Amino acid sequence: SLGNARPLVSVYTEKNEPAKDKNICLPAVFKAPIRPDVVNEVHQLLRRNNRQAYAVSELAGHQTSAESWGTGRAVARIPRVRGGGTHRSGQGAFGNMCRGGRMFAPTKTFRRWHRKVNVNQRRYALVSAIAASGVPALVQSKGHVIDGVSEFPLVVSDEVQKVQKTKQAVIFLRRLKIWADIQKVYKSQRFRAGRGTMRDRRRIARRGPLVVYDKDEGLRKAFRNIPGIETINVDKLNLLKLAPGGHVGRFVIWTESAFARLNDLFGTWKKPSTLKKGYNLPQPKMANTDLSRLLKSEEIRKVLRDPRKRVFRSVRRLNPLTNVRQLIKLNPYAEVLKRRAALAAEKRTVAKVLAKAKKQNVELAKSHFANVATKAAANRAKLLAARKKKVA
Amino acid sequence: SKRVAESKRRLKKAAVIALRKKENLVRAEKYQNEYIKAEQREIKLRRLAKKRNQFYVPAEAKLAFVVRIRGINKVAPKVRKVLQLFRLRQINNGVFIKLNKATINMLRIAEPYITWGYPNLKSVRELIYKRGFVKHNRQRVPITDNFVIERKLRQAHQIQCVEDLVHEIFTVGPNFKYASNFLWPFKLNTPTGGWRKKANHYVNGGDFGNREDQINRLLRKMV
Amino acid sequence: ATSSHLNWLIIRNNNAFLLKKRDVKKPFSTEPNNLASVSSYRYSGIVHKKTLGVVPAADKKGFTAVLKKGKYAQRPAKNTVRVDFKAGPRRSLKKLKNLLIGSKYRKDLTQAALRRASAVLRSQKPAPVKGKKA
RNA sequence: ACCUAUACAUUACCGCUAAAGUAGAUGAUUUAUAUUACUUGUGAUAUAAAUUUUGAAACUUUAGUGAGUAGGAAGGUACAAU
RNA sequence: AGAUCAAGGUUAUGAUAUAAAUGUCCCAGUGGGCCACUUUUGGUAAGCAGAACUGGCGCUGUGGGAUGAACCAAACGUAAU
RNA sequence: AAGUGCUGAUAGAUUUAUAUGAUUACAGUGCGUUAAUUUUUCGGAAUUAUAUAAUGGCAUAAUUAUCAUUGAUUUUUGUGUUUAUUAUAUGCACUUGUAUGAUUAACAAUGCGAAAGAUUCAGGAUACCUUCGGGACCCGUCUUGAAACACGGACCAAGGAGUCUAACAUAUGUGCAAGUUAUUGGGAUAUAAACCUAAUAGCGUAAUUAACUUGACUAAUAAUGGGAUUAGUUUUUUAGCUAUUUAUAGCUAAUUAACACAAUCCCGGGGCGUUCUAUAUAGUUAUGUAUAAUUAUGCCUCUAACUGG
RNA sequence: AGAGUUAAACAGUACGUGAAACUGCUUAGAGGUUAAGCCCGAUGAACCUGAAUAUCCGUUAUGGAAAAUUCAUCAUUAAAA
Fold this sequence. Notes:
This is part of a larger assembly, with chains A (392 residues), B (223 residues) and C (134 residues). Chain A has 392 residues and is mostly helical.
């Protein structure tokens, strides 16, 4: 929508120089969508074109003359070698199970080694790489020591293209605080763990920055022998440089006249491009893309219904036939029938211990007459019934 | 302005929980006095019809209790289907069944894998109190209180208490179909003391088919 | 463009600091601004200026120099470098944790940051102790 | 009476399957207390202390459930290279 | 035989719903079967030959029948009771 | 059938409930009317009215409906009646109290992670040896069925078998969209890469005939036009629900109307083909014809074109 | 067999590593049953792994020292956010 949105990119020069009067505007590729899923899928494929053929000799296997010395000779049935006298006899020819014999399907030259990616999909893989070469969260997650740099995307003046001796390049990469990255590329010069070490790849290190110049006055020769850094020209812009491995966001350095051309290559949000015929910058599926302000939000939290705030687990089934406390929770009336028959069974044992007052007549001291003495005070309920129940 | 709202919720959820407990007391009191006037009437009718020398038949039984008794293999595709529809798919599962001509001819079909009989009130109670579970969107929720019957069945039937389940099942009510399909089938366990043959009829050996009063005495040792 | 959720789903798995270790289901970032060192979404190098951490010291033992986030004066397109500010409390082993709650109020890392400065101040101490047993 | 299965049952654990919940943390929540509007009474404000990220590809809750050749699908795992 | 109006009560046996409905890949394998109740044909009979139904074995362990592909119980995540 | 009144034993006891959500509703204890009654006297003890619909009991009215009907059973109740029964009328504090958050915790004993130094208690079929009990046939394969008196295998290390390609088809990912696709080439050029790019060319955009013919809805508009079954957005009024200023929302629907996506199910309509049929045809436009001079205009129409169901 | 050489001869011409198959010797325990192996429960011997500090009816009552302070009721001042 915008093309502006952070619309002032300061330019720096050789003495780390914040101050110009030249402040150019952010060239609107940098809002276009970062998509590492398409960048990885263009990278997977496009670097299959620097790739030449391996293939085994198509006569390996088959210049014996072995016929299957065939059943019934107590020995199995492979083609065995004919001769006698050379001790390669009979000895097993032609099969992949055999020593000497031809491999399962031998590798040919007309395997598809190279590939064609669609050319908009290259441009919508370069665009996501350029757009992620700003955004220093995604440079810093390639390693890339960038916490000395003073801007993103870092733009140096055009004068650095005239530099000519490499001593005056590590003077330059010192002053812009990016020497500490190419000092990290010195740290990881190692040896490979292959088979590389026999086959002429005895290592890389990691990558470093990428000086995107516009006109090599002497720049490319001046930055050759620094290990880690590599430069590029704005017209070319290889993707396999700007996202090494499928992984967006190499630490990049624009010069001034490099940076001022990106509003032509991939044109702008307003108009198409002039240097790429008919190209039109890709539109994201989600323009605002900040969820924590989308969910914040007061345009949405006047709709939301149910923030169910308990958990409600609390589960265990008790037993309402041994745990009495569940009976009175579940069938509350059944509490009554407990206090009715157990009260009525109380007076039964009261009556049957008074059957011993038929027999031995002992007490009745503080134990069982006191169980029945309350009836005499309970007589007053019937004695009030003759005087207080005659009020209505 | 939230704390004003919740403590009016919290004190109207209290008054409704209080107005269930008394309304589930005097409703269990009314339901209990039915089961005293009922069985005392059938004493009164016999001690009547003896002196008038008539024969008092009692009522034929509605409400069976049907329990799969035997085995999940070697079963034929028409006893395989009746016993699916009776929800009896394991050994020693039991469901409540309303008896008419239309399920009795289905208990006839599934007869050698089923023992059944007509249950006591004590048997109806002890099966939903000790073993009794409940369907909350296919989940088998236990009982744990009588909110969990008040939830799904008070708004569209008038069952809210646990004794309203027992009343809708002992007296086979209009909401019977709702309150047997509410209860997940009773996963009883194996009777202590045992079975007798499991695969000769109750009149010959003792299991499958109508026990018809002795589902109560079996369920004593099964629940 | 730039938001901590778009930035994170690019970084969620293909990171350079995330270094998951072998059984433990996907955690550990070795970031310089993590302070509860897993990889969450909001314990992270750049989550865009909720980026607090707790570093010692430089002078052990007294300090914990705290890199406080260098915030919304920055995009954080870089700064004529600012964006780590390093206000470092000192001099009292359990007063400064009140002076860190007192300092910041960015209530998402807050109890997981003074949970870390304690666990630095637990660690830098033990020089004149763990000695004699005579 | 009693003994006896990998069956039945109640529990712990593993998976599966099916549902359900959580993301305003310059927020939420406690405990006290100062003040307070005061509505009797309960809230709102200040103070002091306290708890409050999760590869949201996560975490939390709940229930059922588990035979398998030929065979198919998912998720891991060993080897070597870019 | 239809196209729009008017009237219609409480939706019209029972019990069930481990979700059902539908495309594509007609994708893999298979296209030698054997056993058994009851029915049955050829044969004198057969652990023979050939069919109808249901269930099994094949693919399936465990308990029982001393023993066993199919019998009788029972179907199988690791454990206690 | 009731708890009737218990007494014995057994095994078991998830839980980082904020390592992103009640420990609170319950009930239970300890302070603040009354009065006699009783009992022990050291407590307790008992007592009414205190407000119910009253539910059960009695009498009676009343009606729904019935086994059998002298009657009984009810049903709706209603009144009176007293006999009982039950619930509600316990705030404020305060407990180490009970419950409920898959209800295990209180008491003791034993023993010190013990500076290096070093014991106690539990556990360890790790991978074996010793001692017993139980179970226990040899794998791979074909087969209806293998421990098979079926085939291969004495043993061990290395090797060893579902691949590249071509062309389709479906599914999924991605880019652009009536389009798309550099890649045969060319250009720039940093190097068999990447970039840029003119004319085509494929495939799609329109089909059907053996072929020649012909070539897609009444219309400046229309998703199988129309019809059903439609998810969903708008909309209707109604009580109505939370908030209400009683404004404005959310809710069910009752229910009005509208468009009805997708998908399937029915009925059409067009293109082309084939066939019947209308034309008896008049007639529709021009050559011709009428004239002037291919030309101008008349108009009949021998001629071709054209209309029709 | 001593000695010597080397960093090393456990690198001495099978000359780097030096696996399995199979085995001479030492040590340990044991031996008449499925031929041996093996599963599961335990076992003797042997070796081994793990083990704990702020409370009942509280991170409460209360006295000693040390050091020191953007802390106070502190106050100004200087910043950087």
